[PDB]
């Protein structure tokens, strides 16, 4: 089997991408944030505290003839940005782009943190990291991909995120028309539960490529590119007037600037992020200070190849017995 679904930016900055997911019988379609940095499929629901729902579409398990309470199971998750959610668990039928999994754990939110309530466009998350990170207790549950894998034509999914435009998540096949050149594959460590890999270096604009190992995660659920402070300083030094602002929370730059590209290495291959992908617009409405899309990871503990990096590539998440990642230009 295969599936193919369009993913759409939630706003004009590409802050996140939403993909329609069918849950239950008859189908209830919710727009979920596919997140290769986490491993829970959780949704706003009829059980979510009413004051914490503000415009999201909810899953109502009592209206699904295939829903079953997973007795005794609870979940609770905290994300790298400080947000969180928790609740109980149903199993139900879940379909993405024509690919159907029966008995998928659907984690129903009883509580969500304010950042979720305040984003009316995201109805939940669909985790695509390794199932060892799933938070369901006392019996850990499998991700949608893990449940689908054996049925897929090939045990892979691909992320093709758009710049200011829709893109595609495919399951079970590699669309050879969706990229240019070849796909370069690179080793993955699953020891932390992430799609963790090592970039071979970077370049700023037309500058020389610096060969250096940068361990990080491929994370579709993180907006920006978070890299070591040395790398980030070298990038922003090429933008006149750019500076790190403690009060704003990162590097800012004059909105009048033209940003240089940023290249990262994948083995001997190179992925070029155009400068425009690194512009996240005014820090507040009407400001001439703009927020940068490349930021320091120093306070995170891990480097993160988020959407800024991934949307410059066609990315293969190869879930074979020994997982690997592939990157192609497009």
From Swiss-Prot:
<keyword id="KW-0865">Zymogen</keyword>
<keyword id="KW-1015">Disulfide bond</keyword>
<keyword id="KW-0732">Signal</keyword>
<comment type="similarity">
    <text>Belongs to the peptidase A1 family.</text>
</comment>
<keyword id="KW-0645">Protease</keyword>
<protein>
    <recommendedName>
        <fullName>Endothiapepsin</fullName>
        <ecNumber>3.4.23.22</ecNumber>
    </recommendedName>
</protein>
<dbReference type="GO" id="GO:0004190">
    <property type="term" value="F:aspartic-type endopeptidase activity"/>
</dbReference>
<feature type="active site">
    <location>
        <position position="35"/>
    </location>
</feature>
<keyword id="KW-0064">Aspartyl protease</keyword>
<keyword id="KW-0378">Hydrolase</keyword>
<feature type="domain" description="Peptidase A1">
    <location>
        <begin position="17"/>
        <end position="328"/>
    </location>
</feature>
<dbReference type="GO" id="GO:0006508">
    <property type="term" value="P:proteolysis"/>
</dbReference>
<feature type="active site">
    <location>
        <position position="199"/>
    </location>
</feature>
<feature type="disulfide bond">
    <location>
        <begin position="255"/>
        <end position="290"/>
    </location>
</feature>
